[PDB]
Amino acid sequence: TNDNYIEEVTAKVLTSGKYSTLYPPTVRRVTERLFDRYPPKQLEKEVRKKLHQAYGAYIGGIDGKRLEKKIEKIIHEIPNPTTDEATRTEWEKEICLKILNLHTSTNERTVAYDELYQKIFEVTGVPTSITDAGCALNPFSFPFFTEAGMLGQYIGFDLDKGMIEAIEHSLRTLNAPEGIVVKQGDILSDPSGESDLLLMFKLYTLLDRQEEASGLKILQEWKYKNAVISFPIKTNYTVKFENDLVGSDLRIMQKLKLGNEMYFIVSRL
């Protein structure tokens, strides 16, 4: 009956309409972390308390059907008549660039996609695959990392299943390559996995906010040839990260500044 409270509390948080479409393992993790330091009773109050704070941010505002409506309108407005490879490739970028302009996460990076992956791959080399943690609308970035040379598999994941379903239905409308895969996941709660190139765009601070010292732990647990970690330029939090690396056994291979974001390319060698 020790692990029951954890499962009962999490099931009660999930069955309710508020924190419904939220990756269940994420709910279990918070619940399992708070159970070690707060009384079994009234845990449901404090788990919800931390969901309103750290997890309420990307869950609030994102409406699954609403997102798909805006994306599906953008695709039908601009027509897709027969043309040349080069021109259709520029059309594919035009639409994907508008889709990226929808949510805040990828709005500011649209100026950089034109050459973001080209610049990242100069350092890391062309990866055989990309894992994109907390992907948001970044899967619609395939036109750019594809011309940059990455024709392998892309596995993007985020917390909201409503968003991810909208992305999957949208990607099929664009006749996207079968290698552009989206699923739901949480790099914080899911088991540590392997990758070639791991992308953590605007996630390190959010991760430390959701759970202390988690971001650095994840970078040491996950196996990857290289990993890209993005931070905004609100002028603070970026210095805290490069300070965290001093103690770890990780290495900064390159530090790139594109648009209004600083990208750190980290490696185990």
From Swiss-Prot:
Molecular function GO labels: rRNA methyltransferase activity
Residues that, per the record, bind S-adenosyl-L-methionine: 58, 103-105, 109, 134, 158, 184-185, 201, 210
Disulfide bonds: none
Top-level class of the enzyme under EC nomenclature: transferase
Keywords from the UniProt entry: Antibiotic resistance, Methyltransferase, Plasmid, rRNA processing, S-adenosyl-L-methionine, Transferase
InterPro entries named among the record's database cross-references: rRNA_MeTrfase (IPR025981), rRNA_MeTrfase_GmN_bac (IPR010769), SAM-dependent_MTases_sf (IPR029063)
Gene Ontology biological process terms in this record: response to antibiotic
Superkingdom in the source lineage: Bacteria
Catalytic activity: guanosine(1405) in 16S rRNA + S-adenosyl-L-methionine = N(7)-methylguanosine(1405) in 16S rRNA + S-adenosyl-L-homocysteine
Record EC number: 2.1.1.179
Family classification: Belongs to the methyltransferase superfamily. Aminoglycoside resistance family.
Protein purpose: Specifically methylates the N(7) position of guanine 1405 in 16S rRNA. Confers resistance to various aminoglycosides, including gentamicin and kanamycin.
UniProt protein name: 16S rRNA (guanine(1405)-N(7))-methyltransferase
Species classification: Bacteria, Pseudomonadati, Pseudomonadota, Gammaproteobacteria, Enterobacterales
